Amino acid sequence: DMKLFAGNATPELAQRIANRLYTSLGDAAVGRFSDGEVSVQINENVRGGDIFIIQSTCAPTNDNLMELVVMVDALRRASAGRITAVIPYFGYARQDRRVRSARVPITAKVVADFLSSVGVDRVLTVDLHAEQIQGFFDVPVDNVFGSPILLEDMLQLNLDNPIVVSPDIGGVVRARAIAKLLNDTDMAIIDKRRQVMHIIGDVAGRDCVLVDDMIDTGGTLCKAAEALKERGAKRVFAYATHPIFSGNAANNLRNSVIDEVVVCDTIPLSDEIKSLPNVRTLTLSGMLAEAIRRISNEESISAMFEH
Amino acid sequence: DMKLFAGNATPELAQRIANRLYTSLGDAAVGRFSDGEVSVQINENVRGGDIFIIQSTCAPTNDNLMELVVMVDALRRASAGRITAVIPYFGYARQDRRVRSARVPITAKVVADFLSSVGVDRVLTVDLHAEQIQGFFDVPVDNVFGSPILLEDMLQLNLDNPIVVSPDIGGVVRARAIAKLLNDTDMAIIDKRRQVMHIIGDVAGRDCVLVDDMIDTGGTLCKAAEALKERGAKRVFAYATHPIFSGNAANNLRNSVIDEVVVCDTIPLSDEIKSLPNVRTLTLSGMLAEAIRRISNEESISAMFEH
Amino acid sequence: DMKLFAGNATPELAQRIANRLYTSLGDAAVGRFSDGEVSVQINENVRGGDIFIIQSTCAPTNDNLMELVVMVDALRRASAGRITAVIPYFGYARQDRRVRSARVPITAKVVADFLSSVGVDRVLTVDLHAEQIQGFFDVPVDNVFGSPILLEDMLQLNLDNPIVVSPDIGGVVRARAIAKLLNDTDMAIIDKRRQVMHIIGDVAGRDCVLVDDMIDTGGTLCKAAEALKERGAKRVFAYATHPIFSGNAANNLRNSVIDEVVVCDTIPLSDEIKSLPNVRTLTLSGMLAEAIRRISNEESISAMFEH
Amino acid sequence: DMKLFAGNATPELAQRIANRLYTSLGDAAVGRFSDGEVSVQINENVRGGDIFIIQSTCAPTNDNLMELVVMVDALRRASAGRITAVIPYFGYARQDRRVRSARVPITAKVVADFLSSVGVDRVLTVDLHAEQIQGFFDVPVDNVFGSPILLEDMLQLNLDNPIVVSPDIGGVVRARAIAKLLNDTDMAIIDKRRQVMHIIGDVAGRDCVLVDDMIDTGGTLCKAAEALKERGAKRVFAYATHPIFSGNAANNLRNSVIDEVVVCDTIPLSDEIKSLPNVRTLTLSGMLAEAIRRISNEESISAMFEH
Amino acid sequence: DMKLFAGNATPELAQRIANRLYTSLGDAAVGRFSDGEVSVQINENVRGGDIFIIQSTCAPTNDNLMELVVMVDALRRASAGRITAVIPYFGYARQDRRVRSARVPITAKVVADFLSSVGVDRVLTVDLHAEQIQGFFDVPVDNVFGSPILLEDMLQLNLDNPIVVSPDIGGVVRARAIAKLLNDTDMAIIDKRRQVMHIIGDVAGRDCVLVDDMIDTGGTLCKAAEALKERGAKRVFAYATHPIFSGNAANNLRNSVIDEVVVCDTIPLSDEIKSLPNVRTLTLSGMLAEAIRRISNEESISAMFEH
Amino acid sequence: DMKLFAGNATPELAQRIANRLYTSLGDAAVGRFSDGEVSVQINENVRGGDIFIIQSTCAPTNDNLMELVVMVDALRRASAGRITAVIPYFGYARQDRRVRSARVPITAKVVADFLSSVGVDRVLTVDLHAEQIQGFFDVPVDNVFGSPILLEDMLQLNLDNPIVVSPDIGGVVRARAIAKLLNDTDMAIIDKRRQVMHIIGDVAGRDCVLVDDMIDTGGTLCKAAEALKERGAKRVFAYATHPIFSGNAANNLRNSVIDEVVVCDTIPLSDEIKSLPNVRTLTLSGMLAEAIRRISNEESISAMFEH
Ligand SMILES: Nc1ncnc2c1ncn2[C@@H]1O[C@H](COP(=O)(O)O)[C@@H](O)[C@H]1O
Ligand SMILES: Nc1ncnc2c1ncn2[C@@H]1O[C@H](COP(=O)(O)O)[C@@H](O)[C@H]1O
Ligand SMILES: Nc1ncnc2c1ncn2[C@@H]1O[C@H](COP(=O)(O)O)[C@@H](O)[C@H]1O
Ligand SMILES: Nc1ncnc2c1ncn2[C@@H]1O[C@H](COP(=O)(O)O)[C@@H](O)[C@H]1O
Ligand SMILES: Nc1ncnc2c1ncn2[C@@H]1O[C@H](COP(=O)(O)O)[C@@H](O)[C@H]1O
Ligand SMILES: O=P(O)(O)OC[C@H]1O[C@H](O)[C@H](O)[C@@H]1O
Ligand SMILES: O=P(O)(O)OC[C@H]1O[C@H](O)[C@H](O)[C@@H]1O
Ligand SMILES: O=P(O)(O)OC[C@H]1O[C@H](O)[C@H](O)[C@@H]1O
Ligand SMILES: O=P(O)(O)OC[C@H]1O[C@H](O)[C@H](O)[C@@H]1O
Ligand SMILES: O=P(O)(O)OC[C@H]1O[C@H](O)[C@H](O)[C@@H]1O
Ligand SMILES: O=P(O)(O)OC[C@H]1O[C@H](O)[C@H](O)[C@@H]1O
Ligand SMILES: [Mg+2]
Ligand SMILES: [Mg+2]
Ligand SMILES: [Mg+2]
Ligand SMILES: [Mg+2]
Ligand SMILES: [Mg+2]
Ligand SMILES: [Mg+2]
Ligand SMILES: [Mg+2]
């Protein structure tokens, strides 16, 4: 008995996933009270059922997170059988350690504990910022890579001896994976010091493909593109998974040298970003639908990592 | 080693409490990242100390709640000794049961579990909506009544044989307590059916004192005042503790028959409400300061319930 | 695989519930050792089954509570699948908070923690003293109102413009619900001060119906009846759900002015009470049987709250 | 800050322990409500203090156990620092396993879980039935042997080449320890089959000393004494620690051949037993007082096991 | 969906159990990394299945224990349904209490907590050293006696009025059970003091059968055999369940007077022990296979304790 | 009351740390029983004390881990106050996620759960393989970098325009940190594909400094050195923190082109490795002693990250 429920964060993606599964979204009234508190009511029998909740913890981050945990609590007191939380974009994931024992929280661990507390049985995400966040839960966590869609889109560009560049030091593993998949090309890395940006590798007269896991303000992306072009690269393409686009992202992308920015749909786009002419969107609904189908049927999930 | 920390919800109240304790607020940078996520950094040694955090979970409710739990987590990983959360207004407290086994959450229990999960050792609140929320925690919870301040203000009005009215059926216990304290006067109750409001009791030619625990939209308050005046009451005064004032509260209070509305300061007032000429504010900083002082010194807290 | 087990508290009610479900009580030897310790032995295979235990925590309260938790432990180590505890009368429910931070326990929370500790999966009660006790558990709790049976009995009295009276301030919500159900009549409330009892409302020349959730000693009930009659009420009927009848209840009811006392059967009656001529009993076996049937079949429980 | 509190089970022993510590019992009102429910109120400040509760879980077993857990809960919500439960006789300790996977509970584990749930920090008992019950807790458990007092009393009898006999197979380890302490004498064991009792060892013309951990009904004790005398033993003395004396114990001991029965005071004696001329009582107040003193002062507890 | 997995401790026994169940061992690669750390990989779909893991915690004890807990963790994150751990020999079981409050651990409780932590749902062992270790878990534990096989082997010896002897005081209960089963014969006990060994009972001119639960170094066994022969016993046979055989066991058994040593196969034998001519092995694969079959089918396990 | 205890893994390091703190190691007998099981006995009063246990989880990994958890359990049942585990080398840390949802365990999370289960209050490690393992605990974890000692040793080599190389893609962050500290030099990275090793960066005619966190078999290190020399580098130095040196490490290092290998002392060296002429050891005893001193005195730990 598979039922899908959606919050207010990604309703359109939840509709696409439901369409690809040939079912319909379950009836739940998820809204706000007068003072801003989350209101949830489940409007159908869920006893013994296998429930999936689809909601990214994107901006407004805290309201979306509260919607998620409150729906899980309402479902779990209504005697639901098993609850899987599909969270295409896992928010607060960049706060995953205390560097130099600074007096900061590990907020990803706090969110994982909240989800375990209200009674989630399984989590399914796309492109976690740190893969060790799989260990912040006591439940199985399936971290699905978004690279098949992006790679299928890259191979339709007919680049002239492309080189894969990671905009920073934290993206090197993902850049290397993409470089191996993209006919096993070269790789270069942007290193930032003091300000001045150094490039480790040769980018002279080649098409450069920047790959990252998110675009928040476009700062690192735009700066790396400027560095690549001023060391003589023909074209630069940016390829990310999570389109956060916060702050001054629209102006940063508009006044940039990036020829094309391609993102997935784990977060809905705003109006100013949709108005931009060089920002294009791929869809992850098929991949998420197949993962949900495999989880619901006691099937192996390893087939989801094939290209 | 008593240290006080404040969030962004009630900073001015935290300053008044610190002033009455002749100390200063501890240094912590509590803010937002670019995308709306809570940022916390403790900027001083808290090892082994006795920490108090002062923050109401008022609107914006979810951001304030996340600030609170994230500060508790950061303090607890920095090896703080004991953490007391002073929460003058406990949000989400109106969702405390499932009526008729409706498929709703018990969100107050969820919030209590989150606070117990991040490592709170003690909670101190003012005028909980339901006193049974004391049982939603495994830690001691001190629910301090705000009625001493309000009563001290009522006794300075020189009312002509006043009668204490509860605007609804849920406020009868608080109304009875106030009526006993206010020279042991009469009590009347507003009952709403179908629309039409019935008054149980005699209110003809008497000064009426409405008492409640919050004013959210002013709906029940304004309607009860209209009923009281159209059954012939001389003057009506409204006395509440938590000034939520959400939605159309300013217009409802402006176009009403209530002569004076008196509230406490557990939630900061907006500009439109401060502009109103018949809304007046009392302060709870002395009572909270004395409660914090008694908790810090291993002293009996029962003296806080004296009039 | 539905199996019913019964303790020693309410065996006759368990038999009626079994009869209405067309099954038989499971074989378990629940008794006492020589020194008063609870002895439990399950005498049949319960592996993977869906178990229901029917036992009120009525007097002797502590022996009944220990029987319940010990049966749950024996069933859970015998590899039972799911255990539902049907507790028609939830004892210790009047101790649900600490008033004025008095150094008392919250014993309802202690009992809820014990039940969660031995491994109960679901609780089903009738007319909880405080509905917030639903939040003292981490499991679903279904609090079924006994008002349908009592209302069906009230409507067969043909009262002359009846008025519904709550004997104290804590029963106002239940009295209001009954008043709405009983053709939407008036409501009056007994208020006790200092001794002297005040009645808020008009009771002159009307049939009065006192409604409460329990009758423990009959003190409040008898006193309220005396007040109602000495302000001129024609007849007084008392309507309760839980017949505790402790202490001097028999003498208090015998030497009273109440014309008829009607109770449910969540607690068995003693001999002295059955000898009384004006105490009558209704049965809840049909309602509990239907609730058990709906829980066992993954059906919606909301239909149980219909009149 | 050492404070002692006592329940209703062993108040006189608690007074003796307080006298030997030159302090007084703390003020707490522990009683019953009208219907038999436990009532507890702490009447003094216990914040930060080191609390000891002295109460055996003797008959009436369940009321005493509930008093204990309810006092612990009331103390723990009043912000007590550390709570030690001194339980001279640990009830329900004979139910410590499931023999042949019988569908019975392990009730000692249930009691240990309840004590850990309400927040006990340390347990101190005398002569546990099974020493592995130390492993049923997550807190330190100090199981103090009562054999020093009993041995000091045995050595004042001037027996003629005594032999130490265990009445059953479960008491062999304790009998061997006593035999080693009692000038390293011989040991014999009673074995019961089918009825007929076999004695392994030689008891002809010797003074026999039966040692056990409890006397519940006197069945095994009286039967073993009869067997010993009908295989020709001069005198038989019975030496136990816990005087349960339930059921027909008074008649069994009166119509027996045991010359003298000596017990400790972990359970108060009834009137019929005190009337018996050959039942004598030793006291454990000094040993328990010294153990409490050593626990309170961060001193080594190993000195308590010296003879 | 019953699947069997085996570790490296008892692979041959796991094969025999699989053969008697007419299935095959599941595919899992359990090995060591270069530095000695346990490596585990499950090579098949286990989603929703009912898993059994067969592995004794025998020498090397800590590597076997780590293999077990690591396999349980890998299975539980792969979404296995229910995990039963068949542990024919439970290691660390001799450390089950703190005698005289010595500063030692209770290591059996630590192992039980680890197994409960990684997510074991049920434990099945053979001949636990202390039966109270059943209470160290929160899950059902089935402690199956190995005495049927040993008794079936004893009855094929045609002994001349045999007597059953326990080599020490801790084995008396097991010796008594065997003596009752073996046509209800006599029993004698070895008592060790100061060195000198005393025998309680008559062993002159009888065949002696020593029964124990393990043979670790053969010290107690060889010494008891010497004592029995030097008080004139015709033949001595040793009967144990767990063949640990550590240290100098081979030399102790070779230079001994025991005519025949019979053991079960809960631990594999070494080469030096297999070379011995008077050490013989029985098999427990049929009994364990039937217990696994009964657990998998929701059948009563009590039939396993029949002779 | 600071007490230090040591296991058998790193006794000599524990002695150096004790010497720098001007105290002595506490008395505890930590050994093995006959069959290989861990034996622990604490031989002094530890009640209320602040305990530190110094032991790396190095090879033999599982015995060392069991020693650690068993000592923690023995200390915690002896009523120790606070227990800090100093684990200079955290074993099993390389298994920190499930790549592509492979059916493997996350063994670092299992070890963290075991340590939290037995009652550790704080962990202090050196150079964790993944810094997110800080989030696998609920207690504070201080991950101290070993780079100050290594950098102080590098600056005493007088290299000719050195370049810092990371032998693999996982070491890039550490290599970048060292490069910034080492007068802000260049950085190059070894990339391995299919076999063939690519170097991103220019290493022609420069002194190369390989930095890693461990040396297990020397495979990556020796291969990277060969690649660097066959692209023309003058000298190659290897700088690591944890000297695991397992398998064929001695032969790999002997038949290599690395001029000098410098390691810390978090793991003791074997004889074959000490015989090597180009392997040199630094000490971390001063840094660990200062960290222990700061933890014991409620001082800020951030001063430990200064160069
Ligand atoms: N999109 C991706 N595809 C494949 N591997 C990835 C990706 N993103 C990160 N990785 C990590 O890159 C590493 C690949 O290792 P390998 O299996 O040797 O290619 C693993 O740690 C993966 O978790
Ligand atoms: N017998 C009863 N029938 C209906 N409501 C009840 C009863 N007893 C208590 N209540 C409470 O009365 C309130 C009724 O609210 P409403 O839905 O507005 O009638 C809810 O809080 C119910 O939980
Ligand atoms: N009164 C007692 N005195 C000493 N040991 C006892 C007593 N009762 C039981 N025992 C147990 O007897 C055993 C004595 O072992 P040992 O130290 O060899 O004398 C331990 O297991 C003790 O726990
Ligand atoms: N092999 C065995 N067969 C039967 N009982 C055993 C065995 N080993 C230990 N026992 C214990 O011996 C006792 C037998 O009690 P009974 O049922 O009176 O024979 C129980 O406590 C059993 O757990
Ligand atoms: N030895 C080291 N010194 C400094 N940072 C390190 C070291 N090893 C790893 N790191 C990480 O490198 C990053 C340095 O960031 P930054 O503060 O910008 O230099 C942090 O994530 C550190 O945790
Ligand atoms: O706003 P930006 O910093 O440019 O983008 C967010 C980046 O912060 C993290 O490294 C992510 O990997 C992104 O690369
Ligand atoms: O917006 P309003 O409903 O008028 O005020 C909030 C009320 O809702 C609860 O009963 C509170 O007691 C208040 O009386
Ligand atoms: O013995 P009594 O106090 O008269 O009856 C018990 C009452 O105590 C509680 O308020 C219940 O609602 C009852 O009304
Ligand atoms: O009433 P009784 O059975 O004679 O005495 C209780 C006995 O039950 C247990 O074995 C105890 O050791 C006692 O010996
Ligand atoms: O090496 P051994 O001590 O002779 O054999 C192990 C014994 O230790 C325990 O009592 C077991 O019951 C065994 O009898
Ligand atoms: O035996 P090796 O693989 O050469 O050394 C262990 C390496 O495995 C991990 O990447 C560590 O960072 C090391 O670099
Ligand atoms: Mg980045
Ligand atoms: Mg209200
Ligand atoms: Mg009442
Ligand atoms: Mg006995
Ligand atoms: Mg033993
Ligand atoms: Mg033995
Ligand atoms: Mg590496």
Residue D183: closest CA among D159, D212, D202: D159
Phi, psi of E41 (to 5 degrees): -145, 125
Task: Please give the structure tokens belonging to residue C31.
Answer: 């008794």
What is the helix (H) or strand (E) element at residue B291, kind and residue range? helix B285-296
Residues in chain C: 307
Yes or no: say if B83 and A49 are a contact pair by the CB < 8 Å rule: no
Q: How distant is the alpha carbon of residue E83 from its chain centre? A: 21
Structure tokens at C248: 């001097």
The reply to whether E223 and E292 lie within a common domain is no
- Residue type (1 letter), F108: A
Rounded to the nearest whole angstrom, what is the distance from the C-alpha of residue C192 to the centroid of ligand 14? 12
Q: Which residue has the tokens 């260049």?
A: F186
Residues with CB under 6 A from ligand 10: E 168, 170-171, 212-221
> Maximum Cα–Cα distance for chain E, whole Å?
62
- C141 and C168, same domain (yes or no): no
Rounded-to-integer distance, Cα F279 and Cα F254, Å: 10
Strand duo E186-192 + E197-200: pairing = antiparallel
Q: How far is CA C147 from CA B45, C173, C241, C306, in A?
A: 59, 12, 8, 10
The total number of residues written for chain F in this structure? 307
Q: Are strands D208-211 and D197-200 parallel, antiparallel or unpaired?
A: unpaired
Q: Does B77 touch chain C (CB under 8 A)?
A: no
In angstroms, this model's resolution equals 2.6
Rounded to the nearest 10 degrees, how much is the dihedral formed by the CA atoms of A37, A42, A43, A45? -170
Residue B180 backbone zone (phi > 0: left; psi -120 to 50: alpha; other: beta): alpha
The token duo for D64 is 């005493």
* Distance from chain centroid for Cα A33: 29
Contact C45 E122 (CB under 8 A): no
CA distances from C32 to C36, C70, C301, D216, E110 (A): 6, 12, 36, 14, 34
Q: What one-character-per-residue DSSP string does F182-243 give?
A: TTS-EEEEEEE----EEEES--TTS-EEEE-SEESSSHHHHHHHHHHHHT--S-EEEE-SEE
Chain D touched by E143 (CB under 8 Å): yes
CA-closest candidate to residue A76, choices A42, A110, A108: A42
User: CB neighbours of E87 closer than 8 A, spacing ≥ 6?
Assistant: E55, E56, E57, E68, E123, E124, E125
The CA-based angle C242-C247-C249, given to 5 degrees, is 60
| Strand, coil or helix: F287 | helix
Which DSSP symbol is given to E263?
Answer: E
Identify the DSSP state of C19.
H
Q: Which residues of D touch E93 (CB under 8 A)?
A: none
Say whether A300 and E77 touch across the interface (CB within 8 A).
no
Is residue E113 helix, strand or coil? helix
CB-based burial label for E280 (10 Å; 0-12, 13-18, 19+): exposed
Which residues fall within 8 angstroms of residue E248, CB to CB, at 6 or more apart?
E217, E218
Domain around B201: 146-282
What DSSP element (H or E) covers E288?
helix E285-296
The gap from C-alpha B151 to its chain's centroid, in whole angstroms, comes to: 16
- Cβ of residue C138 closer than 8 Å to a chain D Cβ: no
Q: Which residues of A touch F181 (CB under 8 A)?
A: none
The answer to whether A187 and A202 have CB atoms below 8 angstroms apart is no
Do D22 and D169 lie in a common domain?
no
**Structure tokens, A27:** 């009836």
List CB contacts of C98: < 8 A, sequence separation 6 or more.
Answer: B134, C104, C106, D77
Neighbours of F104 (CB within 10 A): 21
Strand order in the sheet with B279-281: B197-200, B186-192, B163-166, B208-211, B236-239, B260-263, B279-281
- The residue among F245, D132, B111, B23 whose CA lies nearest residue E133 is D132
Helix axes A147-154, A172-181, angle to 10 degrees: 50
Phi, psi angles (nearest 5°) of residue A124: -135, 120
Contact F45 D122 (CB under 8 A): no
Same domain, F263 and F288: no
Query: Looking at the annotation, which residues of A are catalytic?
Result: 192
Backbone angles phi, psi at D6, to 5 degrees: -130, 145
Query: After which residues does chain F break, using C–N > 2.5 Å?
Result: 194
In a shared domain, residues B194 and B132: no
Same domain, A47 and A167: no
Is residue C213 within 6 Å of ligand 8 at its C-beta? Answer: yes
Give dist(CA E3, CA E47) in Å, integer.
11
Q: How far apart are CA A136 and CA A257, in angstroms?
A: 39
Ligand 4 in contact with E181 (CB < 6 A)? no
CB contact under 8 A, B70 and A117: no
Do B74 and B2 lie in a common domain?
Answer: yes
Q: For residues F22 and D255, give the distance between their C-alpha atoms in angstroms, rounded to a whole number.
A: 71
The rounded distance, in Å, linking the Cα atoms of C96 and C260 is 31
Burial state string for F47-62 with b = 16 or more CB within 10 A and e = fewer than 16: bebbbbbbbbbbbbbb
Q: How far apart are alpha carbons F66 and F73 in whole angstroms?
A: 10
Q: How far apart are CA A101 and CA D244, in angstroms?
A: 58
Q: Please, what is the end-to-end C-alpha distance for chain D in angstroms?
A: 30
Residue with tokens 């670790």: E216
**CA F109 to each of CA C176, C300, F85, F87: distance values in angstroms, whole numbers, following the listed order:** 55, 40, 16, 15
- Element housing E87 (H / E): strand E82-87
- Angle at which helix F172-181 crosses helix F147-154, to 10 degrees, equals 50
Q: What is the CA E42 to chain-centroid distance, rounded?
A: 27
Whether residue F172 sits in one domain with residue F133: no
Distances in whole angstroms, Cα of residue E234 to Cα of each of C16, E194, E255: 68, 28, 18
Which uninterrupted H or E stretch holds D186?
Answer: strand D186-192
The method recorded for this entry reads cryo-EM
Write the Ramachandran bin of A127: left for phi over 0, alpha for psi from -120 to 50, otherwise beta.
left
DSSP bridge partners of D84: D52, D122
Residue E105 and residue F77 in contact, taking contact as beta carbons nearer than 8 Å: yes
Q: Taking a C-beta distance cutoff of 8 angstroms, is the pair C292, C304 a contact?
A: no
Three state DSSP letters for chain A: CEEEEECCCCHHHHHHHHHHCCCCECCEEEEECCCCCEEEEECCCCECCEEEEECCCCCCHHHHHHHHHHHHHHHHHCCECEEEEEECCCCCCCCCCCHHHCCCCCHHHHHHHHHHHHCCCEEEEECCCCHHHHHHCCCCEEEECCHHHHHHHHCCCCCCCCEEEECCHHHHHHHHHHHHHCCCCEEEEEEECCCCEEEECCCCCCCEEEECCEECCCHHHHHHHHHHHHCCCCCEEEECCEECCCCCHHHHHHCCCCCEEEECCCCCCCHHHHHCCCEEECCCHHHHHHHHHHHHCCCCCHHHHCC
CA–CA distance, F211 with F194 (Å, rounded to integer): 23
The three-class DSSP label of residue B17 is helix
Q: Atom 9, ligand 5: which residue's CA is nearest?
A: F174
Reading the block at residue E51, the tokens are 């898993």
| CB-CB contact of B96 with B129 (8 Å) | yes
How many CA within 13 A on the CB side of residue A258?
30
Q: What is the count of structural domains for chain A?
A: 2
Show the beta-strand stretches assigned E in chain B.
2-6, 28-32, 38-42, 50-54, 82-87, 122-126, 141-144, 163-166, 186-192, 197-200, 208-211, 214-215, 236-239, 242-243, 260-263, 279-281
Reading the block at residue A72, the tokens are: 């899980």
Angle CA E107–E97–D187, to nearest 5? 140
Whether F12 and F140 share a structural domain: yes
| Cis preceding-peptide flag for C60 (omega within 30 of 0) | yes
Q: Residue C180 corresponds to which tokens in the numbers above?
A: 């709405």
Question: By the 8 A CB rule, do A4 and A293 touch?
Answer: no
Secondary structure letter of residue D80 according to DSSP? B
Token pair 């190059």: residue? F188
Q: C82 vs chain E: nearest CA distance in angstroms?
A: 14
Query: Can you tell me the distance from the alpha carbon of F231 to that of F156, in angstroms, rounded to the nearest whole number?
Result: 26
* Helix (DSSP H) and strand (DSSP E) numbers for chain F: 9, 16
Ligand-binding site membership of B307 (annotated) = no
Same domain flag for E262 and E238: yes
Please name the residue whose Cα sits nearest to atom 3 of ligand 1: A177
Interchain CB contacts (distance < 8 Å): D and F: 11
Which residues lie closer than 8 Å to D51 by C-beta, 6 or more apart? Answer: D3, D5, D75, D80, D81, D82, D83, D84
D119: nearest Cα among D71, D188, D185: D71
**Cβ(D90)–Cβ(D128) under 8 Å?**
yes
C229 and C204 in contact (C-beta within 8 Å)?
A: no
The count of other CB atoms within 10 Å of the CB of residue E168 is: 17
How far apart CA C223 and CA C201 sit, in angstroms, is: 17
Instruction: Give the C-alpha separation, E97 to F188, whole Å.
Output: 58
Distances (CA, A) of B151 to B157, B182, C171: 10, 7, 26
- Sorted by sequence, the CB contacts under 8 Å of residue D207 that are 6+ apart come out as D159, D160, D161, D162, D163, D233, D234, D235, D236, D237
Spell out the alpha helix ranges (H) of E99-218: 107-118, 147-154, 172-181
CA–CA distance, A61 with A95 (Å, rounded to integer): 14
For residue A303, count CB atoms less than 10 angstroms from its CB and return exposed for 0-12, middle for 13-18, buried for 19 or more: exposed
Quick one: F39 exposed, middle or buried, by C-beta within 10 A (0-12, 13-18, 19+)?
Answer: middle
Distance from residue E221's CA to the centre of ligand 17 (Å):
9
Closest CA to F106 of E32, A134, A90: A134
Q: Among F268, F187, F218, which residue's Cα sits nearest to residue F6?
A: F268
Angle at CA F159, nearest 5°, toward F157 and F165? 105
Same structural domain, B213 and B266: yes
Rounded to whole angstroms, the Cα distance separating F255 from A112 reads: 48
Alpha-carbon distance of D39 to D41, in angstroms, equals 7
CA atoms within 13 A on the CB side of B96: 17
d(C-alpha E14, C-alpha E85), whole Å: 12
* Set of chain D residues whose Cβ sits within 8 Å of the Cβ of B298: 45, 47-48
Distance CA C208, CA C182 (A): 12
Q: How many angstroms away from the CA of C202 is the closest CA of chain D?
A: 33
DSSP letter at B39 equals E
The Cα B236–Cα B224 span in angstroms is: 10
Spatial distance between the Cα atoms of B104 and A208, rounded to a whole number of angstroms: 52
Segments of F232-278 assigned E as strands = 236-239, 242-243, 260-263
Phi–psi pair at B79, nearest 5 degrees: 70, 40
- Breaks in chain B (C–N > 2.5 Å) following residue: 194
**Ligand 4 contacts CB of residue E250 (under 6 A):** no
Same domain, F89 and F140: yes
Q: Which amino acid is at F301?
A: I
Contact E162, E143 (CB under 8 A): no
Spatial distance between the Cα atoms of B290 and B302, rounded to a whole number of angstroms = 12
Are chains B and F in contact at 3+ CB pairs closer than 8 Å? yes
Element (H, E) at D122: strand D122-126
Q: Which of E88, E86, E83 is nearest to E2 (CA)?
A: E83
Of the candidates A45, A48, A79, the beta carbon closest to that of C140 is on: A79
Q: Residue with structure tokens 């009525």?
A: C58
If one counts every other C-beta atom within 10 angstroms of the C-beta of residue E204, the result is 9
Per the CB < 8 A criterion, the answer to whether A128 and A111 are in contact is: no
Contact C299 A79 (CB under 8 A): no
